[PDB]
């Protein structure tokens, strides 16, 4: 076990398409799947999970290759990875649609499942990352404030295993810089919390898998150009940070091109890591959006 499991939850494994996925699950009721992003694992949801579990069955998987999940056997593009997550969720909700909450590259790895299987998704919450499309080619490499928030896209996508070679042995140092530089509320990331995430990402196959998601990003863009010919029809909510490190208004503005029914919120003073930086306001918004009318 890489992270403490909340009381009332089980840490378990399930083979999907030949790949052994790790997840933490608890609660009773309709299914909500929470999908973490880069630099983290299922554990980023550990404050939201006990709350949602009062009314829902909550499952939080580790993305393939990350946390305690095996790497994918097909590949790291969004459409390939979405298969695993879709099948995992259906094993627990084969007869009813489920809700989906995703953060950061959790968005990349679920959008294809959502758009191709809309009857399976009841409500959708996306936070703090772009859906892979040509808009990401407009983000600046360098800014009047110095170090940009997106230069890691190219570092991670670089060939010759550049990122593995430079970061191996310095995973803790790189991850602290990465996380804090994308945060407004930097203090929430304790020395011990950073050590836990670094321990997980320093596993050789997790270090490589991290970067393979970015190496597959251009293929994800090409996939999504075709997939986005169909708009999303289910109720959708976007969340973005309004502070340093966040997406700001981009998140909702992009989502309006993909979804018919979308409400968006920007959390002021919050950066990229909403579940940890702004837990109480974010948790309330998610629980509210998923509970209303039921």
């Amino acid at each position, epitope marked *: 076990e890489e992270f403490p499991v909340p009381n009332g939850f089980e840490s378990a494994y399930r083979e999907v398409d030949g790949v052994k996925l790790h997840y933490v699950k608890g609660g009773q009721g309709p299914l909500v799947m929470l999908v973490h992003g880069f630099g983290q694992t299922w554990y980023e949801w550990h404050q939201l999970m006990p709350e949602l579990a009062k009314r829902f069955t909550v499952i939080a998987p580790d993305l393939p290759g990350l946390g305690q999940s095996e790497p994918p056997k097909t590949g790291y593009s969004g459409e390939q990875v979405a298969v695993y997550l879709h099948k995992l969720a259906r094993q627990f909700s084969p007869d009813r649609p489920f809700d989906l909450v995703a953060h950061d590259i959790g968005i990349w790895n679920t959008y294809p499942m959502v758009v191709k299987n809309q009857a399976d998704i009841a409500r959708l919450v996306y936070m703090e990352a*772009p859906i892979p499309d040509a808009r990401i080619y*407009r*983000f*600046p490499a360098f*800014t*009047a*404030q*110095g*170090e*940009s*928030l*997106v230069w890691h896209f190219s570092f991670f996508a670089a060939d010759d295993r550049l990122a593995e070679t430079l970061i191996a042995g310095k995973e803790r140092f790189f991850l602290e810089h990465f996380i804090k*530089s994308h945060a*407004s*509320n*930097t203090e929430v990331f304790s020395e011990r919390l950073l050590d836990l995430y670094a321990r997980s990402y320093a596993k050789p196959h997790s270090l490589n898998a991290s970067f393979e998601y970015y190496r597959a990003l251009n293929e994800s863009v090409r996939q999504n150009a075709e997939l986005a010919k169909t708009r999303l029809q289910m109720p959708t909510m976007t969340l973005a940070g*309004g*502070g*340093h*490190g*966040g*997406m*700001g208004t*981009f998140q909702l503005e992009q989502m309006k091109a993909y979804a018919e029914d979308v409400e968006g919120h920007v959390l*002021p*003073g*919050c*950066g990229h890591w909403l579940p940890e930086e702004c837990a109480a306001p974010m948790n309330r918004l998610v629980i509210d959006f998923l509970s209303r009318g039921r």
Partner: nanobody
Amino acid sequence: VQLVESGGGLVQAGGSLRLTCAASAGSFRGYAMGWFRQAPGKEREFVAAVSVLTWSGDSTNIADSVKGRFTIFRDTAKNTVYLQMNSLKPEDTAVYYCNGASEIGALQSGASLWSWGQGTQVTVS
């Protein structure tokens, strides 16, 4: 948030100054920041504003009264904000203040989030 301005002084016309805005308590890392000024006799007026850094970049707005002479920028390692004042004129004489808002547009409209600090006096002789 407790705001502290510094860097003011007595300077000659055509000279230059750089003002610093810092937080002695709290943090304005999560917020857009702006500079304001007020002379004894006049109203307090917006001078310049800079956004937070997002994935798409950032944005600034410079009041027409100082456009081409003053610039604003942030240091995201120090969590400070600066006002670089070039080509100083006597009518730039005033107390200079910093404050924050959720976006630069609110600052442009004179709105701000926190109690004003003491400001820093700029006198151009």
